[PDB]
Symmetry: C2
Subunit: 140 residues, 2 copies
Amino acid sequence: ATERTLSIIKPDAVAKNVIGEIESRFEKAGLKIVAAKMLQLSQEQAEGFYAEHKERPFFGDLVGFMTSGPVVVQVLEGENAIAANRDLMGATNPKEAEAGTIRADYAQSIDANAVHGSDSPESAAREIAYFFEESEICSR
Amino acid sequence: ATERTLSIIKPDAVAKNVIGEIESRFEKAGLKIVAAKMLQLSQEQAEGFYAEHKERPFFGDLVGFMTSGPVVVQVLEGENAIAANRDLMGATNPKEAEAGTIRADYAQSIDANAVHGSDSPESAAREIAYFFEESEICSR
């Protein structure tokens, strides 16, 4: 089933100016970016998005980094988009990621991994809704 | 002098899913996308942006096409950004564009050229202002 998932090119990947390179991995894999916008997350914005880790000791670092610079939040749409995305991204922890994946090629650490992708249909739906209004998403 | 210029990945380039490929041309050339958002231009939006051609016989086709699908409007920032951008884009008319340029590689015609770039400092300033608020632009 064709589905929608949220993807975020993180502060570290944009600073390296590899936005195009990452986009191409998704597009070459048959997924389409149907919504996208570059922005600088506010303390409040990042905290509400990672609310689930609100009380975990890594919270500050998660939010801290993820606010260290501008990012590109977007929506990828395609066949098996959510899982397909997870396959291109690689393991969350760059050091345990298979070669060829985005994290293995562009990430420096857990905090500084290069991208973010929803892990499931349920989270994809709330993650997308959190950053975008239906009008901002243009399927095609 | 480092400057800012407006760039638009057009309906034809996005439909071909070469967004990443185009972005990479700018990033490899040392320019940074400091603002960006994907959207579907409204009749009214495209008309006000190309107001200057409001009474030209190609207006309808210009607007028509440029509204045929979603686009990515953005801001490129860097050394000699405006002219540098014009150099990577190639001649407005794809058929007279030097090989290696964006238009020579991705464009099908005058209407359907793959990108748009401001032609001068004065137009860059009004073009950027038309699509973005200062807050949306994140220099770095």
